[PDB]
Amino acid sequence: MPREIKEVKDFLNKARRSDARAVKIKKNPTNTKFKIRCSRFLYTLVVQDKEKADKIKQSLPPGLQVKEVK
Amino acid sequence: PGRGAPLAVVHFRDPYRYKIRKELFIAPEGMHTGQFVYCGRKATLQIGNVMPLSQMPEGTIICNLEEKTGDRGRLARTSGNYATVIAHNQDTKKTRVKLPSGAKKVVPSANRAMVGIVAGGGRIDKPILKAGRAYHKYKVKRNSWPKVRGVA
Amino acid sequence: RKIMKQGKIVIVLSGRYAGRKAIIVKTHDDGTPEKPFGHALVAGIDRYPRKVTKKMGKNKLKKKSKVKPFLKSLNYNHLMPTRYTAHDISFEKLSPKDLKDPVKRKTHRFQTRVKFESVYKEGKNKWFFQKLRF
Amino acid sequence: AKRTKKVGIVGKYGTRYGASLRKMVKKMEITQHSKYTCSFCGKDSMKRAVVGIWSCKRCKRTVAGGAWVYSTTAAASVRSAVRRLRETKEQ
Amino acid sequence: KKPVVVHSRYRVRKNTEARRKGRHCGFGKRKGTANARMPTKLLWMQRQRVLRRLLKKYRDSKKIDRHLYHDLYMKCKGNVFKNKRVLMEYIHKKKAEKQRSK
Amino acid sequence: VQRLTLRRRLSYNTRSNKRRIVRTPGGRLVYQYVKKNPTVPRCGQCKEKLKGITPSRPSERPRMSKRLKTVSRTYGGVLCHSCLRERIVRAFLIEEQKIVKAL
RNA sequence: AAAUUAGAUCCGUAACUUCGGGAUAAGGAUUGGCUCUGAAGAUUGAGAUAGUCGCGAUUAUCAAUUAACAAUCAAUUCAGAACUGGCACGGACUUGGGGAAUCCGACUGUCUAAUUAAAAC
RNA sequence: UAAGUUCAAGGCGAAAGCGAAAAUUUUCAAGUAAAACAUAAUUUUGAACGAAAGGGAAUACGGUUCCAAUUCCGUAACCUGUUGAGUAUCCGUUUGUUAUUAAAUAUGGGCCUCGUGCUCAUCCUGGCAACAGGAACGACCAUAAAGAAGCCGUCGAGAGAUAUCGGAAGAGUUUUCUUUUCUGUUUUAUAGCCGUACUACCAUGGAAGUCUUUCGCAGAGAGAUAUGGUAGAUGGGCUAGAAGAGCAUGACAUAUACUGUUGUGUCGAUAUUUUCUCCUCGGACCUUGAAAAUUUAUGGUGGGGACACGCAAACUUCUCAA
């Protein structure tokens, strides 16, 4: 997967897209990944702090689909 | 390959078209990359200019001589071989040259030759020593064989 | 006697301006410790003018006859000097070493155009504004 | 040390071909594989690519030479002879 | 899925361990030539590297200078030195023979 | 070890099945096919490689940027910087001999 | 036909010779197991001397090291010795008999697929 | 495209057809955001076939079947073509602001009530350089390069494999011994990063008391050593893919009752002259080791665009989308 946004706002910029159909949220033991699914590519935002990770689980577009993987 | 004399790639400009002509020559010995070649009637006598056989002095050693005029280089063009301007006959315009056979032929005097011996001489003094090295000689030439004798 | 003096038209020999012609504005003969080698600040031409014939009228005329310069401090080993000296370029008064700031590389390189074309007509330094197929 | 008393470069053909043709080819087998001093920049770097063509590793000049020797003696007697006809016929 | 057959490396590990102590390395146990068992070209190449990285260690520490370095570099190819200890011996006395004379 | 098989129907060893052994996330030991070696352009007379240009391959260069194929100066991806000034001074001292031979 | 020799280490090696050779000439010695011993490397070397503040943490350096500088670490090969058994030890296997000449062809090469591989080509 | 082949009317032959290879052939072939007292510049070897091993755009993993998988499924990419969108030109004046400025790759000039008056100006920048960055005049000519290459060797690098030693999790032997013996202990393509093997280069500077250097020689007043830079991200490590994914080893739980789950997946260091690649540097040769489509860079004359008081742009060599 050829992309990864190391910045917060340029990940959320890739949420309000005509594509960007889904955010497949994974919660790892040390961080949460926010893997947003545009046409090609998919785009991971690794956030480590475990608490604004839920502040960026909100402030997403509403109709954007969100998975939460098990 | 096959030809034991080196060749030289010379780049002239075209006088009527707008490109660069790329001529293969047969190398005068001493020709080197980056040097100038002058071809024409008013060529100075130096290796390897090519100029008509009337603008030469007598005894001048030449190679790549035209048999008939304009026919682009037909005589003394193997490795180590040359022709010699014997003597003009000033009008009737027929130079006599001496050819690598020993034979002495009369050319015209408007045809061209390049000054100098040809490079790559003299190949033929090394023994081949080796049937497999004559194999290699001839596999870039033709099927003159291991020539089995007819008496066999 | 000393060459690479002030008004001498040099030839750039290295780096994004190779082949261009250049006057010299100010010479540092013995190496200011930032660039301690022998160098000089030049003022040359990036984009040459183009020829005008009599048939092209007025704004095809002014379009072929612009000049784009440059301003570059260069080594003495990356220059080739000529016999030719620019003469009526006489107002290099305020261009010493203030081309570190970016906006005054543009209030000056524009101000080398107000003189590199005032000497284009009238035609002086005719070898300077020729392309010279290097 | 010295490894061969007499053959030199033709011990590689060793006991092959007869002593005269080994002796004969050795003269040519030394001058080819020699490094001649380059007559364009001065270094001992004028080696032979193919038969008749010699080139220099620095300065990048290829010349047209002899089969084994860089310049033959039959061709330097032509470069002399041509310029003493050039001295007469020019001026 | 029927477990794999045990293939034990116990026996070979025991004889590699004996043959650090030199247990089966004699003239009845040698089948390659001494060049095939240990290549002289590899042997002389590691020696020539041991010596050359010693001499760059001494020259660039500050110890010897260029003129002794090159004289020993050329002597190192040769057989004046077989180890790095005899080269360290030789350096240790041509600095004794030198600063005495200097 | 896990021995390998070829995944293309070219079973011979030419210059266009260049392959490398890979381990995959299933612990697999599979073959990956290598394409051909990218090279840089040469100087117009040195026959020495140029610098400032990425090593490219003749189909890849449409899908490369401009500045990935150029240096930035005159004769950029064509000649060395040294062969360039060998021409700038030669194109000047010859065209200045042709004024002192005219006057 | 078969047997003999055969690995490796060491010593030694004639007639002739196109000085390359012949030559692995010939001729001999050594060889297992077990306990040690020697030699052949790499990488950081290793830093000695107030005490502010409370030896502790913020806390020094030109060089001389040196003649095994000291530990770590790394592979493997080669020489030596002592003891030790049915001399069985290159313990299987892998693996040359040698020499004195005569004739022919110089050599490596090629040939009669299915009777001739040669001195024939 | 090769070696070559089939045909094309010069021809020839009673013809078949040359077990021709035609190279035949008045303009036999091209060219035009297409012209003027010929529209006007140019080229003839026609043509096609001939490589499932040469050249040549783009993909990998995990899963799945009674039978197919680089093809299905899931997942993550990529190429080609055609459209669309975003995005190299958001000024000094004067709005927020008395000038100082702020919106702002962003002016200068001269005077003028200052100027809003007048006038000038944007086909990009940086570095001494080697060269660099997200883009920053493919419309033809010209030149150069890539494609593009043999055989024997080779220092170095990485990969794969094998082997050592530790840790976690199982297994095998146990009369006796054996901190034992074994097994597995994984990370694709694609891509963002940082670095390196070695090589070339650049700046400084000027070398004999010659020095740098290789296993080897090789190199230097045609510029060595030295110190600092550039390039080749050769070939590797971090991150993304990677959903304690997936996978594999393994502890339970749940009957076919149409399934959930806890843990592991960690260190170090060998030598692979014997594998594959990458880089270097050589040698033998009266033997010098393919061609074309395809592709790019540059250069050239014209011609195209662009104007500040701001509206823009961009077959746009940039980013994305359909």
UniProtKB/Swiss-Prot annotation, chain A:
Signal peptide: none annotated. One of its GO terms (biological process) is cytoplasmic translation. GO terms for molecular function: structural constituent of ribosome. Pfam families: Ribosomal_L38e. The keyword Ribosomal protein applies. Keywords: Ribonucleoprotein, Ribosomal protein. Coiled coil: none annotated. GO terms for cellular component: cytosolic large ribosomal subunit; cytosolic ribosome. InterPro entries: Ribosomal_eL38, Ribosomal_eL38_sf. The keyword Ribonucleoprotein applies. Belongs to the eukaryotic ribosomal protein eL38 family. PANTHER family: 60S RIBOSOMAL PROTEIN L38, LARGE RIBOSOMAL SUBUNIT PROTEIN EL38. This is Large ribosomal subunit protein eL38.
Curated annotation (Swiss-Prot), chain B:
GO terms for molecular function: RNA binding; rRNA binding; structural constituent of ribosome. Keywords: Cytoplasm, Ribonucleoprotein, Ribosomal protein, RNA-binding, rRNA-binding. It comes from the Eukaryota. GO terms for cellular component: cytoplasm; cytosolic large ribosomal subunit; cytosolic ribosome; nucleolus. GO terms for biological process: cytoplasmic translation. In larvae tissues examined: gut, brain imaginal disk, salivary glands, fat body, muscles, epidermis and trachaea. Transmembrane segments: none annotated. The keyword Nucleus does not apply. It is found in: Cytoplasm. Belongs to the universal ribosomal protein uL2 family. This is Large ribosomal subunit protein uL2.
UniProtKB/Swiss-Prot annotation, chain D:
A zinc finger (C4-type) spans 38-59. GO terms for molecular function: structural constituent of ribosome; zinc ion binding. Transmembrane segments: none annotated. Keywords: Metal-binding, Ribonucleoprotein, Ribosomal protein, Zinc, Zinc-finger. The keyword Ribosomal protein applies. Belongs to the eukaryotic ribosomal protein eL43 family. It comes from Drosophila melanogaster. One of its GO terms (biological process) is cytoplasmic translation. One of its GO terms (cellular component) is cytosolic large ribosomal subunit. This is Large ribosomal subunit protein eL43. The gene is RpL37A. Pfam families: Ribosomal_L37ae.
From Swiss-Prot, chain E:
One of its GO terms (biological process) is cytoplasmic translation. GO terms for cellular component: cytosolic large ribosomal subunit; cytosolic ribosome. GO terms for molecular function: RNA binding; structural constituent of ribosome. Signal peptide: none annotated. Keywords: Ribonucleoprotein, Ribosomal protein. It comes from the Eukaryota. Belongs to the eukaryotic ribosomal protein eL19 family. This is Large ribosomal subunit protein eL19. It comes from Drosophila melanogaster. The gene is RpL19. The chain holds residues 52 to 153 of 203 of the full protein.
